[PDB]
Amino acid sequence: TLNKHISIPKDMSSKDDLDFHFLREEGIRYIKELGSNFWTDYNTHDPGITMLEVLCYAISDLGNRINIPIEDLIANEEGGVKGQFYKVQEILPSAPT
Amino acid sequence: HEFPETYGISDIGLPPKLGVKRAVLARQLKGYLLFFDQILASYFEHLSKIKSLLSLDQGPSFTYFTQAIKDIKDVEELFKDPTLLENDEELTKSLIGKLDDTIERRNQLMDHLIARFAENFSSYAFLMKFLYGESTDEIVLQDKQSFLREYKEISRER
Amino acid sequence: VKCLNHTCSSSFQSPGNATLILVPDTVQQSVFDIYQPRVSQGTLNDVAAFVNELNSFHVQAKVINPNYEEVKVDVKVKFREGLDVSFYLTKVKEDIKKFLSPWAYDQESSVEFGVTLHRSQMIHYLEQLTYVDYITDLRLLKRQAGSSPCNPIFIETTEKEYIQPSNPKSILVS
Amino acid sequence: KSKDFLGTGWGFPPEFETSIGQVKTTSGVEDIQKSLEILFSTKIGERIMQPTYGCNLDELLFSPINRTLKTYVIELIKNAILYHEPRIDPEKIDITQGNEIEGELLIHLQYIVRATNSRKNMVYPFYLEEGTN
Amino acid sequence: INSHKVTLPPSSSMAGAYARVDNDRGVWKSPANIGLNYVSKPSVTVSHE
Amino acid sequence: MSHYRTVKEGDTLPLMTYRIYGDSKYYLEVAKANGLTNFRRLKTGTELIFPPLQKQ
Amino acid sequence: VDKGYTMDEIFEGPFLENGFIDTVELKASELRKEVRLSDIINIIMSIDGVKIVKEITLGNCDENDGIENNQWVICIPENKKPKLCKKTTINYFKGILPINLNPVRVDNHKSKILASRLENDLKAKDDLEPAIPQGTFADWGEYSSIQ
């Protein structure tokens, strides 16, 4: 119950919705498959590409909140779990027969 | 709010010397981008309702949700009827509307919660049709919610 | 498992008692007699002790073997077969026995129960890759079973293979 | 259809038409000219995962005009182009003061469009086999 | 209690800034485009319009 | 890399191939990539492409 | 083509303006000689939601249909097509309780199921031919003097 030293991992790669670079590459792959007849310039000054990067950033934010633990996601303003769960003191005991 | 000032869609606006046409084009872009924001706002809104969807006291009437977006300076002009931005429930009915098949979805949620206690309400599906017509769908969902609320005593004092 | 609410060995209407019937899996047929599966004394007694502690101060339950008894099918010849040998009537008989055996003892069977109407039996056969039709079928109890004494009850009166009794019956011949 | 490695893309101040449901696009030399307008309209830290994109010309506001300044201006412009616009070669940068009183500095950039494809040019049917660095 | 901060009119910071410019470049150099110390933000945001 | 030129009067296909590749022998591959049949007479407004050589 | 037929086979018979007809289906749709319970039962048991057929019987539709044989197989005269007699019926149950059906709802389901078949027969009328590669034209014999 002592404090531990805190650090951050260095392998920032997951190939999922929390991985910015992964999302960006998939975005471009989809664009070529669907619209390369008309949209071929994928340089960084392009408004199209700019919009893609903004959206990828927004997706990471959403994924990060989905991973918040249950204890907080279903918390009540006043604390407790009154409308969510029945407690052991209430749901496990049996009438005496 | 993630774009540069050059685009002209941020809080500080766009300098007057650049002319009206450029200001108009900025308005057109704001319109376009709302198609992406309204969807994202819905997903965030849906997280806020998990507590209600699985409540033992009383669930919600809707299963899909949306939000007004108000951190955009001209939304009062972009929308044909600003009234909806004053009430997320009206906005939900207008934007999602029928796509939300509430009767079937509400039953699936209730059946799951009931199953967690190893109980089963399948027979209401037809027994109630000897008492009521089309009105059984509302009646049955009300009864299932009552059952969960009263469960602590029901399963114990046998 | 089967619980019998008012059953005593001499009564089906006695209050204050109960009988439980146990059926084993007997998957390892290398040992077990799969047409007479039985529970040993160890289990019959352990079950009774376990339950009697949880019932009520006033009630003891009894734990028994099912003492199985059952009727068996005969039918019109199949209108088709893969071959006289490959889908011999004997092969069909073996398949029929397995389908019923799965109720009596653990085995695989698509049908919900052996104790069913001919409609279920017909579907089970129709599903075969080596069949086309059969004009008629029946499954009365073996009144003509000489080994078990004569005068045995038959199951002729249009029953959907109903068990002969609440207990001491199985309707799972094979 | 010889000049297909300069590419095609969205116009910078994107305009939406209603006579057809489309957003206007640019190509070739027109596309290059709008790229330059974008680059010199944005600051270095304004893009999210592109922390080094844009220019520092604002550093020179509210300063006197002399030889040292002019040398510094030229350096800033040339480096921004070398890093961010692969399709051109600068030809001449002319820096002059047209107003005795008004605080104005006038910069005229002249450039040449390349006839051969650069290794930094991300245009779809080319970079796949030609974009080494 | 200590989370609450002080808000001030800008004139005293400008007098400081004037001194810096006079020492670094001279009295003929404009005071504009100089950063302020100990400032979190302007009280209000002023648009281009 | 890739290259484009415009045909001026006085140009021939094997002389232009020599100045771009260093060898005159690639003239039949340049003509096939441009769809030319009468390559011995070029018309003086045509824009041609010059593809790079394959590497492996 | 998706079915696996080739050109020689697809165009084997008369050309038909309304779409292609599959020879296998055509051979199969011959006038039936025999009807039997072992097939009818399988049809009913395979419908999703059906659990048990408790009673079933066939019979030549006739008058004074009193006590008669099961008719496990019914034979049909050599130039006739069999058809349901419209005096047929199915009693539906859940557990041990009988339930009642409404004619308008059934008619609507039947109509939708069959109407969707017409839509495909109509679509079949447009796609009746393969593509042929097309070239250009350019005076292939043009010649310039070696001088």
Place this chain on the structure above:
Amino acid sequence: RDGTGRRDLLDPKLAPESVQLQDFELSDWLIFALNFA
């Protein structure tokens, strides 16, 4: 009645998967856009 047994012990609506909190497809978001426009 035949009581119960091992093959009859599966509850079809206990497994969490039976509930899909979000079920829209690409085609539903496109309908959304047609109205929103």
Place this chain on the structure above:
Amino acid sequence: FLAAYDQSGKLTPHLTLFVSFLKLLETSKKRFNQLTKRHLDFYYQEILHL
């Protein structure tokens, strides 16, 4: 429509972005729909301690 243009290279750019965005969101649906399991597990293992 979606089938016809899948990998055709023929859509107008404003639809190209909208559809690519909708495809990227499929990974959010995958994560979001696992909440029902996490909820159940929490109740049986951390609230009831079983």
